Structure formats: C-alpha cells, structure tokens
Amino acid sequence: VNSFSGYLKLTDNVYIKNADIVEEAKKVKPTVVVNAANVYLKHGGGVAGALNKATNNAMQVESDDYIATNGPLKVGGSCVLSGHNLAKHCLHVVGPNVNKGEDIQLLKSAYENFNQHEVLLAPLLSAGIFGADPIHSLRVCVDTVRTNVYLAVFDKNLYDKLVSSFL
Ligand SMILES: OC[C@H](CC1OCCO1)Nc1ncnc2[nH]ccc12
Ligand SMILES: [Cl-]
C-alpha cells in the first residue's frame, strides 16, 4: 500500500492520472520522482523546467555540478540526484527528443532505467516538447517497466485520449 491516490490502473504495475507532476510530488513526496531530462541536465522547460522551478533552482545548481564532474548523460541514460523538496530522489532520465532527430528506439532503453526503482512517480518519456507520440510512449512504458509506476499526465485532453485508446 502507498499514498498515490486517484490513479487509473492500466496494468498490474502501471497506473495513470491527470495531474501536474510538480503538484503530485509536493503532495506525495515519493521516494523517486522522474525528470524528463536532457543530456546536459539543462532544466529549461517542459517537465524539467517546472520541476526545477519548484526547487527554487536548487535542482539546476546540483545538476551543473554533476555535469562539471561527470559530463553529459547518454540519450536513453539516467542519473540519480536529490529530490530536493519534492521527493527523496530525482531520477533524471533522457528520452529521445524527436525535435533533435534522436532515435525513437532509445525510448525503450530510457524506460529500462525505471526498473532499478521499486516505485516511481513519472511523466511519459519523450512526450510534450520532446516531440514523440504520447500514446506510443505509454505503450513502451507498459511493455518495458516492471516496477510500480505512477504516471502523471498534465494535459487533461491528452489524459482522456491515452485512457480511451489504451489496449
Ligand atoms: O510527457 C510529458 C508531459 C506531456 C503532456 O502533453 C503536454 C503537457 O503534458 N508533460 C508533463 N506531464 C506531467 N506534469 C508536467 N508538468 C509540467 C509538464 C508536465
Ligand atoms: Cl512537456
């Protein structure tokens, strides 16, 4: 039993809800919140920009130190950093950004990072400003993640379409 409330069960372990991931994280304070990161951990917009804003830019400061030490992430890769005031940890995961010409097959590799954590609050990878088909992102999530994932979808119109089109 966990404190995630109001989710629709798509599968044994995949759940979905229309919610602002920032407001969800602030309410639940999950062990792991997933960020829709880029390889430079530059959290300028989308989910990443909103999560970083909610930390008063502390996420960006920590991320800049991480990059200075370790260099960029790989597309499909991840790193674990602090969750600041939002969660215990933030799993920064880089899905392919279609608007940069990155291979959509890497979306499965990106979701595989979730399997290293028993429970996560997450957005749909490569959706939104990363330019992939969100119905596809949900399909890959359900077919790749085996741990318990609570998916937050900000756009209500999109949420209804994902549910009604889910197989
Ligand atoms: O796949 C990422 C989704 C994309 C979907 O389509 C257009 C907007 O929402 N973005 C978000 N999902 C959850 N919380 C969020 N906070 C800020 C952005 C955001
Ligand atoms: Cl987005």
Swiss-Prot record:
Record's subcellular location: Host endoplasmic reticulum membrane
Chain's role: Responsible for the cleavages located at the N-terminus of the replicase polyprotein. Participates together with nsp4 in the assembly of virally-induced cytoplasmic double-membrane vesicles necessary for viral replication. Antagonizes innate immune induction of type I interferon by blocking the phosphorylation, dimerization and subsequent nuclear translocation of host IRF3. Also prevents host NF-kappa-B signaling. In addition, PL-PRO possesses a deubiquitinating/deISGylating activity and processes both 'Lys-48'- and 'Lys-63'-linked polyubiquitin chains from cellular substrates.
Organism: Severe acute respiratory syndrome coronavirus 2 (2019-nCoV)
Entry superkingdom: Viruses
Domain Macro: 1-167
Native organism taxonomy: Viruses, Riboviria, Orthornavirae, Pisuviricota, Pisoniviricetes
UniProt name for this protein: Papain-like protease nsp3
Subunit structure: May form homohexamers. Interacts with N protein.
Impact when changing residue 164 to L: In strain: Gamma/P.1
Catalysed reactions, semicolon-separated: Thiol-dependent hydrolysis of ester, thioester, amide, peptide and isopeptide bonds formed by the C-terminal Gly of ubiquitin (a 76-residue protein attached to proteins as an intracellular targeting signal)
Membrane topology summary: Multi-pass membrane protein
Regulation of protein activity: Inhibited in vitro by GRL-0617.
